Amino acid sequence: WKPDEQGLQQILQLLKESQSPDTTIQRTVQQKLEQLNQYPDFNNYLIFVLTKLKSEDEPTRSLSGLILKNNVKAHFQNFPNGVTDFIKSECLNNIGDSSPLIRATVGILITTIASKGELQNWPDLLPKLCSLLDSEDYNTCEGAFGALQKICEDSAEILDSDVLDRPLNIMIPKFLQFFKHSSPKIRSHAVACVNQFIISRTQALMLHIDSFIENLFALAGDEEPEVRKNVCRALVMLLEVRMDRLLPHMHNIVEYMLQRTQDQDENVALEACEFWLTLAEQPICKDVLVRHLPKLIPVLVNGMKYSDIDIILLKDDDTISDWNLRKCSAAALDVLANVYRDELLPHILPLLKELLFHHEWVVKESGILVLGAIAEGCMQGMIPYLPELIPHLIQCLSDKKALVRSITCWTLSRYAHWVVSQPPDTYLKPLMTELLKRILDSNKRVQEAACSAFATLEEEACTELVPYLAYILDTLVFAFSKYQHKNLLILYDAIGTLADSVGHHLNKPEYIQMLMPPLIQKWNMLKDEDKDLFPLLECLSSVATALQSGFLPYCEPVYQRCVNLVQKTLAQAMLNNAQPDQYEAPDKDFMIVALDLLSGLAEGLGGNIEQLVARSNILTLMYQCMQDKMPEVRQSSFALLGDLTKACFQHVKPCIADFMPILGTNLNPEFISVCNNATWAIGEISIQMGIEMQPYIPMVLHQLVEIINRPNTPKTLLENTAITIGRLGYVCPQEVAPMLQQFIRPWCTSLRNIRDNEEKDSAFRGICTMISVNPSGVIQDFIFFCDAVASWINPKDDLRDMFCKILHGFKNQVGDENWRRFSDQFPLPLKERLAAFYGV
C-alpha cells in the first residue's frame, strides 16, 4: 500500500485545520473526520503521517496517531486484517523513535490496539516487546518497557490464564533481571510490571519469591522516588499474600517503612502509610509492632493534619480526594485502636492533651479527629476523661473555623453511647441542643456532619428524645428548605431514625402537620428512575410505622407507587428470564422494600387499608413474589400475606386456595426467615378461615411437627411454629389433636419462655381445645403442660378456667395419692403457682 498524492494533502489539510485556536472553526472540521471513519482505508493514511511523513512537524504527526487511536477505541472490528497488520508493523518499528512525543504517541497506540483489539489477536506482540527490552538503544528499550507496563496494568489476569498461552513464565523472570538496570526509569518499569502479579499469586512469581524479595531489598534505598514508591507498593502487597517469607525481616521492614512514611515525596509517603493499615489487619500485628508504637503513633497522628492544599481546596460532590495521607493515617489509627484497645492509650493520650487545646486550628482539628478515630477500640480507657472531654467538644461546636465544627460533630457522635448512658441533663441535653444548631449551619460540610451525628445520636437515645420531639422536628422540617441534595439524603436518614427511635410517640396531630407535607411534596417530585426513590421510601416506611393510623390521609400515593414498583420489577424479571441479553435483570431490593412498606401500611392502618387493597392487584403480585428464586422476596411477601390476612381477610379469602399450596412448599427450615414467615402466615390464616381451614390442615401439619422436633433451630422459629400448631388445633382440633403426643414436649419448652400476650393466649386456647378432644395424647408428658401453664402470670378469666378443668380432671383421674407424688417435682415458685392459681 502507498498513499495518494492529493489524498494525502486532503488529510494533511484536514489536520492543519484542527490545529486552529478557535472552537467554532475547529469543531467544524472534526465533523468530516467521522464520515471518513467509515472508510477504513482512511486509517492507512492516518498512521502513515505519524510514522512515515517525517517532513512534517511533531504536533501534527502526533495528532494523526492520537486520532487513529480513537478510530480503534470505537469501531475497531471495522478494521481489515491488512490494515491492522500494517499499523502493528509500523508501530513496533518506531517504538523507540528519536522524538519523545512521537514515541509516546506510538506507545499509547500499541497500548490501545492491545486492550481493545484483545491480546490473542496480536499473537507475537509480547515476545517481540520482550526481545526489544534487550535492545541497545535506550529509547527503544524504554519505550518497549513502557508499553509492557501498561499491558500488565490493563490485562493482568488475561496474561495470568491459558486464554493466551502462559506468557508470564518468560516475562516475570525477564523483568526481575531488569531490577539491576543502570537506568532509574527502567528499574521502575520492571518493578511496576511485577507488582501487577503479587495479589493474583501468579506461579511464575511465587516460585521466585525469595529471589524477588531480595532485589526488592536491594532497591529499598534507591534515590529515585518512583522506584521507592513501587518497592513500598510491592511490600504492602506482599503483606496480604506472602507473609511467611516476609516475617523473618519484619522488623527491618517496619524500620524502613517508618522512615518512608515521612518521606518528602507525597506519593512514597502515602504508599508507605498503606503499610500500616494493611499490617494492622493481620493477626501477627499485635506482637510485631509493640516496640515501634512509640514511633508509629506520633507519625500517624502527624500525618492526620489537613495538608495546606486540603485547606485551600475547602476553606460540587466531594471536592477533596477519596483517599490521601490523612485518611489513610486515620484509617490505620482506627484499626490499631481496635487491635491494642486500652493498651494504645499510653502512646496517644499525652499527644491528645497537647493537641485538643491548641491555638492553631489545623492542629486542634487533627486532635479532635484522633479523639474520634480511637473511640471504638479505646472506649473503656477513655471513659475517665469523657466527663471533661464531652463538654469541651460541645464548646468546640461553636468554633469559628467550619472544619473544626464538622469533625467535632463527628467525634461527638463517636461517643454517643456513653453520652446517653449519663443523666440526660448533663451531656445529652446540651449536645442535642448544639447539634441541632449545627444542622442549620451555613456551611454545607458542617450540615452533613451535624445531621449524620444526630442520626447517630438518635439511634443511641431512643425514648430519651421524646421530651424534645417538638424541638427536633422544628429544625428537621426546616432543613428541607435549606438542604441541597447530598445532605438531603442524610436528612431523610435523620427523619427515618427519629421515627424509628421515638416510635408511636410521634403520633400527635401537630407533628404530622409539620412533617408530612414537605415529605409528601418531595414524594411527588419523584420518578421510578429517581436516585432519591430508595432513601425516601425507607424514610417514609419508618414514618408510616410510627404514625400508625395517623398516616391515613397520606398513604394512597405511597401505597400506589409501591404496588407499581412490584409490577415494574416482576415484569422486567420476566423479560430478562426470556431474553437475558436483551433486557437487564432488575434490582430486586426495591421490590423487597416496597413489599416491606406495604406490610408496614397493613400493620399501621389495619382495617382502613381494605379499600386500597381491593382496587389493586397486590395479591396477584404477592403470589408471584412468593415464588421468587430469591428468599428475601419470599420472606418479605409472606410477611405481607400474614399482615393482609390480619388486616382485611375478605380480599384475601378468594386466594387462600392458591396461597396455601405455596406456603406448604416454603416450610423449608434451611431458609430460616422464609420458613418463619410462612409458619406465621399459616397461624394467622387459620384464625381467619375458622372451621373452614379443614381441607388445608393436612399438607402443612407434617413439616411443622418435623420442624418443632428438629434440633438446633432458632428460638424464634420454634416459638412461631408452636404458635401456629396451637392455632390450627383451635379452629380444626379434629385433624391436629391426634398428634398431641409427638409435638407436646417441645411446644411447652418453647412457649413457656414467651410473655403472656395475645399470641400466647391464642396458642394455649388451641392446646386446651386439642386436649379436650384427645386427652390421651397429653397424659404421657403432663409434667411439661404443668410447666407451660405455670409460666402464665395474667391469663384471661376463661383460659384460666380451661387450665383448671385440665389440671383438675387429670388429677382426680389419677387420685390425690398419685398427684401429690407427681407434685414433688415442682420448684417452690411453681408448686405454689398452681396451688394458688388453680387450686393445686
UniProtKB/Swiss-Prot annotation:
PANTHER family, alphabetized: IMPORTIN BETA
Biological role: Functions in nuclear protein import as nuclear transport receptor. Serves as receptor for nuclear localization signals (NLS) in cargo substrates. May mediate docking of the importin/substrate complex to the nuclear pore complex (NPC) through binding to nucleoporin and the complex is subsequently translocated through the pore by an energy requiring, Ran-dependent mechanism. At the nucleoplasmic side of the NPC, Ran binds to the importin, the importin/substrate complex dissociates and importin is re-exported from the nucleus to the cytoplasm where GTP hydrolysis releases Ran.
Full protein name: Transportin-1
SUPFAM superfamilies: ARM repeat
GO biological processes: protein import into nucleus
HEAT repeats: 7-34, 39-77, 86-119, 125-162, 169-199, 212-239, 251-278, 347-375, 387-414, 428-461, 469-502, 510-548, 556-607, 618-649, 657-690, 698-733, 741-774, 783-814, 817-837
All copies of domain Importin N-terminal, residue ranges: 29-97
Residue ranges crossing the lipid bilayer per the database entry: none
Subunit structure as annotated in this protein's UniProt entry: Identified in a complex that contains TNPO1, RAN and RANBP1. Binds HNRPA1, HNRPA2, HNRNPDL, RPS7, RPL5 and RAN. Interacts with H2A, H2B, H3 and H4 histones. Interacts with isoform 1 and isoform 5 of ADAR/ADAR1 (via DRBM 3 domain). Interacts with SNAI1 (via zinc fingers); the interaction mediates SNAI1 nuclear import. Interacts with SNAI2 (via zinc fingers). Interacts with RPL23A (via BIB domain) and SRP19; this interaction is involved in RPL23A and SRP19 import into the nucleus.
InterPro entries, alphabetized: ARM-like, ARM-type_fold, HEAT, Importin-beta_N, Importin_beta
Protein's UniProt keywords contain Transport: yes
Keywords from the UniProt entry: Acetylation, Cytoplasm, Host-virus interaction, Nucleus, Protein transport, Repeat, Transport
Localisation per UniProt entry: Cytoplasm; Nucleus
Family under the similarity heading: Belongs to the importin beta family. Importin beta-2 subfamily.
